[PDB]
Amino acid sequence: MKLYFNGGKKAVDFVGTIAKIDGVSADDIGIITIMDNASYVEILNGKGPHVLKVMKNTTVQLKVNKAN
């Protein structure tokens, strides 16, 4: 599942808060895409919904939402 964060040009950063989420590790972090005013990262192994809910409560406080 692709998860958007309102942070872009204007990867190591998102691997690092996401990798510390309960029940998640680097192996659940897929491709990272960076655009001008937004970025998204593919969350693997069905953990997308979980990562999104946890990130709504986790500071790095970016606005997160499901791409799809």
CA-CA distances (angstroms) from residue 48 to 12, 15, 17, 41, 64?
A: 18, 14, 14, 10, 11
Name the 3-class secondary structure at 15: helix
Q: How many domains does the chain have?
A: 1
φ/ψ of 22, rounded to 5, equals -50, 120
Whichever domain contains 67, its CATH number is: 3.30.70.330
At 51, the amino acid letter reads V
Pairing label, strands 39-43, 29-34: antiparallel
**Structure resolution in Å?**
1.7
Neighbours of 40 (CB within 10 A): 21
Range of the domain at 22: 1-68
